[PDB]
């Protein structure tokens, strides 16, 4: 173990990857949320190209 790497939402290595809208609603996640941001200390971060 060499450390922890932040995970981008809805990406292949997130817990919401591939889930249906019913599962998203069960997890209290909006099915319309686009994803593509990190959660760092609670706040949501977006990388700018």
């Amino acid at each position: 173990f060499i450390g922890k790497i932040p995970i981008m939402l809805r990406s292949t290595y997130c817990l919401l990857n591939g889930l249906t809208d019913r599962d998203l609603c069960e997890l209290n996640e909006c099915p319309l949320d686009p994803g593509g941001y990190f959660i760092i200390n609670g706040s949501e971060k977006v990388l700018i190209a």
Partner: protein, 49 residues
């Protein structure tokens, strides 16, 4: 800590050398409207002063 700090503050580099580190990456996601969220997630930047 390195990944978490660089994503949290936006100063892309090591903490000791946050002088020449380019600030302005990793902004906090806009959540005023869905259009604001989308146009924030699809955004570019020219590093010109």
């Amino acid at each position: 800590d390195g990944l978490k700090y660089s994503l949290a503050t936006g100063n892309w580099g090591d903490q000791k050398k946050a002088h020449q580190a380019r600030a302005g990456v990793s902004q906090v996601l806009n959540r005023l409207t869905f259009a604001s969220t989308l146009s924030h997630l699809r955004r570019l930047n020219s590093p010109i002063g």
